[PDB]
From a paper:
Xylitol dehydrogenase (XDH) catalyzes the NAD+-dependent oxidization of xylitol into d-xylulose, and belongs to a zinc-dependent medium-chain dehydrogenase/reductase family. This protein family consists of enzymes with one or two zinc atoms per subunit, among which catalytic zinc is necessary for the activity. Among many XDHs from yeast and fungi, XDH from Pichia stipitis is one of the key enzymes for bioethanol production by lignocellulosic biomass, and possesses only a catalytic zinc atom. Xylitol is then oxidized by xylitol dehydrogenase (XDH; EC 1.1.1.9) to give d-xylulose.
The so-called PsXDHC4 mutant was previously constructed by substituting Ser96, Ser99, and Tyr102 with cysteine residues in the wild-type (WT) enzyme. Catalytic zinc was coordinated by interactions with Cys41 (distance of 2.3 Å), His66 (2.3 Å), Glu67 (2.2 Å), and a water molecule (Wat6; 2.6 Å).
Author numbering:
A (entry chain A), B (entry chain A), C (entry chain A), D (entry chain A): 2 to 120, 125 to 362
The structure:
Amino acid sequence: TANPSLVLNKIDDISFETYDAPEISEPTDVLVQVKKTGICGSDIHFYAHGRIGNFVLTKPMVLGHESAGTVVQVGKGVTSLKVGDNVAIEPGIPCRFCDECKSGHYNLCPHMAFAATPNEPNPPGTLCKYFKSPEDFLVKLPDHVSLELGALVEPLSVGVHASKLGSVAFGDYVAVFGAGPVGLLAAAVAKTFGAKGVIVVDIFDNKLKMAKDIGAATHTFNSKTGGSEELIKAFGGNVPNVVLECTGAEPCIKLGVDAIAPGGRFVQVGNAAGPVSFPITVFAMKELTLFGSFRYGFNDYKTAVGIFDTNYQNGRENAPIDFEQLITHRYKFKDAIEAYDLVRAGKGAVKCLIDGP
Amino acid sequence: TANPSLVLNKIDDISFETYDAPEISEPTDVLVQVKKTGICGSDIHFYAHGRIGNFVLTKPMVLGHESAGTVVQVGKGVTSLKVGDNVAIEPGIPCRFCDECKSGHYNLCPHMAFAATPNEPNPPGTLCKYFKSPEDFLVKLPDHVSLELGALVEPLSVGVHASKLGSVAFGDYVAVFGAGPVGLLAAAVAKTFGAKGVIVVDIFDNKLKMAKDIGAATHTFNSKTGGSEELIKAFGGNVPNVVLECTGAEPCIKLGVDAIAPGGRFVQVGNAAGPVSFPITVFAMKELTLFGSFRYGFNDYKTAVGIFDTNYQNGRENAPIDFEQLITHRYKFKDAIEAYDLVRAGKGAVKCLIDGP
Amino acid sequence: TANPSLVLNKIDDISFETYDAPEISEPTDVLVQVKKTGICGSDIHFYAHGRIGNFVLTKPMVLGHESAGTVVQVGKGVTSLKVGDNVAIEPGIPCRFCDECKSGHYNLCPHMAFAATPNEPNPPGTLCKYFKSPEDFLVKLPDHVSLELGALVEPLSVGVHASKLGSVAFGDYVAVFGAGPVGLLAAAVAKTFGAKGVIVVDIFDNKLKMAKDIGAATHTFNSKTGGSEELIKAFGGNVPNVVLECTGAEPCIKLGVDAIAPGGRFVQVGNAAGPVSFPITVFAMKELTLFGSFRYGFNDYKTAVGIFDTNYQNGRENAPIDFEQLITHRYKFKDAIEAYDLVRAGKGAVKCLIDGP
Amino acid sequence: TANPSLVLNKIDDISFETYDAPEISEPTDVLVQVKKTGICGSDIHFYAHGRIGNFVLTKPMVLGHESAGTVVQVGKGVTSLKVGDNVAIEPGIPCRFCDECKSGHYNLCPHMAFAATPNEPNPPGTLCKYFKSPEDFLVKLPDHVSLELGALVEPLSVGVHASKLGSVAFGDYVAVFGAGPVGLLAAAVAKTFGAKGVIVVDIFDNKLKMAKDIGAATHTFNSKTGGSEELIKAFGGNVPNVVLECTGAEPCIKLGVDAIAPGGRFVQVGNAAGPVSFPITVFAMKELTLFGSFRYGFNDYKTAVGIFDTNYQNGRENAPIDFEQLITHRYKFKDAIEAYDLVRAGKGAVKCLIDGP
Ligand SMILES: [Zn+2]
Ligand SMILES: [Zn+2]
Ligand SMILES: [Zn+2]
Ligand SMILES: [Zn+2]
Ligand SMILES: [Zn+2]
Ligand SMILES: [Zn+2]
Ligand SMILES: [Zn+2]
Ligand SMILES: [Zn+2]
């Protein structure tokens, strides 16, 4: 009944506290011992500013939102997990009653309680020992899927939701903008879903080489080389069918619009700091479709975990994409702040994982 | 075998010429005596600059693209029209062979030969006496549908294609931006298709009153009053479900994005002069969908004509929307240049129609 | 805290009992005084056999499933209804947790607790005084929408769900098979949604005349006249675009398949007693699509109530379809069994309504 | 200018004739030397009866419809093939003008001129030396894709069109009924498109073992073992998501409906001799969707050829599915009738290929 936690109290203040362990109350409730936890731009954002958009921090918040754990207790009504399963954690829990939820878009639930987002008490975070989640928001991990990759499920589901919105199908030609963690996993999904070509675009040659090395990308393109024609030439002349915009920057959005084929599908997952200059008219003349993608929805976690399942079922040696390279740093729970400053400093970590207490 | 025509030779030079009448060649070909012709921003655009985007004028071009006529000759294989029917004219003819055509999107045919667009000879224009069109690109006009409204079919099909892309259905709440001709007809389609609310937004009080007067709009809003909350208040508190952007201006695009409901559908039909500042991130966080709409496609003309059919079948007195008010000026073929300068001067004409020779 | 109820105990045994009134427990719970209640083939089915399919009766069941009432009590969290609103009742409540619910298809919830269906205690029925329902499963009734029509919402939602599955849109040509209550309301939806033609098919000339009289059908056809060609001729030569099969009988299914246009949409809402002889190959050669329709889903009730709203907003005198003719008998709660035997005997009632205690 | 051909004159009469070689006329026309040709149930059907449905034979018909050849001549306007490419042949050519064609469904063109179907002269067949086809109805064959498999493209496209109608996507669980050529290729598509499970069902243990051996099926089930529960048990407990019905027989259609998950997608590609007994009501209660699949449409051939492309790009040794086993017999053009009687006798050939003259 004791629970150590990483906590962000105020700006640049991260401390280790110890709260009461969450207790099971609902019959579908499940208690999970968090073992791994990922880190992204949103974790350092609250650390540096305490505000993303209008999400603003007003109380001691418990941290962490890309985690995987082990079931340690279940309620009466749990039928999909026993005590002792490895689970990926879907951090955002919806109301199940609103019209967004009822329509199959708990995605956009206005009462969405997300892990490690502020604002009535603060929705709990996963950088603790004991996390409480409903049964249907944990995905059982296959035996060959690492407890590490369970933390990688969260940014992978973001890419699954996006490629689904873009209706990525066999023989497609997808252009993913941004060779960061999300943009890398997104390219891995497109190729997994059967795309004949997956070109990854960014300005870091190191990140582009990794895209090609893990096998998630068939082509790469450095966007300081030129415009749309060179991107097409770098793609073997194939003109992109879907554009997965994971960057949120004008030069990438602009480049993705000139390059994409008429009638192509353009998914927006990257977030800008504000408004951006947009080529609105060529968008119209090409009859493009812009999909705003926000986090992940129904079946997205299970689908992402299943990507790990089939990718690694015949051994890491025979795995078609080497997702584990996305882990460049590993830290114990004691060294958590050494990990946050590490990612805050941008030392060259694509993804950093922290163990549980 | 003699055909008078309105012709734009060079900038600000519009003259009356007389060319050879088009002759039937293909078995599906149909000759049409053009009787009415509409006028829009694109007609005055070529008049003033001779260039829209990269469509640039290099030869004497025959003018006109929103017309209706009477069948005066048919080929052997014509089975849907006899000599003497009233027809609306779909001005853009595609190749039928390319992958855009074959996929049901002759819309985006790269070989699209549109009427009164330059660039091999110039695709013919409708401001003449005898126009040549394939059989499947004319729509027979019901007896109660005016030969005038047949010219109005062209900007109405633009609104039909747009509301279809937006999947406008019963009980929807649509916000149309721009109370011009296209934006007016677009609102008429949304209400026709069963929208519970159709609010029209612009800055001209005259144009907003006309939207409400012809019955195409249930609400109106002048966009100098305020932002999204006032637009919602002007809509009876109903939050918009679909946004039909017929303006192409930043303040309207910006306003349509804050106002629209999460998961709403946003159709872009207005064209900007260049790039525009876009709220790309709230677009993502709301999981909106942006549809680029470009002209009209399969079944769009027939659907628009059918809107005239059912609107006017039980008499103009019982017609639910008074489309004829959209005709504020009428001109004979001799007074064509007096009509072009009239619309060029912006005297207050919503739509101006010119008779055939 | 006293609640009289109509109850079916065993076959042919219907009695009046008095149980304890349901009490509010959940914060979203709402107590409703049932004022009107409809009757259909399923109510008499359990009366005559006590079994529909594998739904079999094993305990005293409280009866009724097409009702409308008045709010008499609310919980803390209710925000969409105050004490005293007129509501239509959606009788089937889902679990909100299963994958069918989470995907936006509470429709197919395997834990669906429907009103007046057996099989742990029996889900309550509406033929009582005080009914308990969650807030989001009641639809507030506009002031001009009769408390009677609120009971008619249930079979109307069945038709809304069906026409949505069939993607009924403007200018469509719909053929509804079966001029009973459901088939009549289904035709009213198709015409409401903008169908250019709605032909109703059955063998009762009385029922066909009513379809045309209330204005829900533009054409009618008696299926003992002939086959598909006569059905087309009866439709003004227009070939059907959507087929709404509300009958469940072979001759109607067979006729709907020959008549429908290639690529047409065929919705199956009628239920057969067992397997039926089906023209499976012409189905394939025409590239038809068969939609199994089962009850109603998200937004279907609100949409049906909205059909009443807009149909009757400018007065019964100006209402485009006269839904009230569907009420041919009215009974007080005391005379409930006189009403069940009346509909059991098939005296000529299209829909019969019973008041609450 | 001389062209030998296999010809079916009357029932059981197949002879070798020599007609005039087809000459290029249209600028998009292409002349092809047919090198391989497949054989299916439709070829022997016309041989035995001279009638499929209402397709009835009234003249000497030139035979063959599953072929691949080599370009030997092109017209002026050909831009996608040079003289000397290996091509798969799409045998059915549409009008490009009708509403089915214009809507992107040349599939259902009422003027469809298919190869080796009767009824104005007889549309030509591919069992000759020189075949004439438009440019956009040939698919260039990658260098590693056998000229044999080009003949296999035709029954593979049938499976591509079907799995597309069923929206087969990653992680799906597909049940294909019928382990014949079409049903085998259909299973290969489902697994290719990313299905987590592809169970093939038939009554021939030989054919089921081949499904599993070429790797197109993860599970198999012999339908004389039992009903739906055993089919699920044979599938590892996974309940089917899509059902691909390639058989046209009642016991398979019946079994596919009980087995499929609620809301599942059921594609009908097999053809019955007449009407069949159908479980119409469980279809409704499960909210299934029945897709009639008829031949193949836009992009289906290119997609099928691309399946060969990616399947064999890293060598037959590393190919994930061994499509070539589907060729159990090979014949020269002289021994064509020995091949037709061979397949007519049902000696055990899954697919038989005949060389060109
Ligand atoms: Zn993150
Ligand atoms: Zn919610
Ligand atoms: Zn125009
Ligand atoms: Zn084209
Ligand atoms: Zn009922
Ligand atoms: Zn449920
Ligand atoms: Zn075949
Ligand atoms: Zn055609």
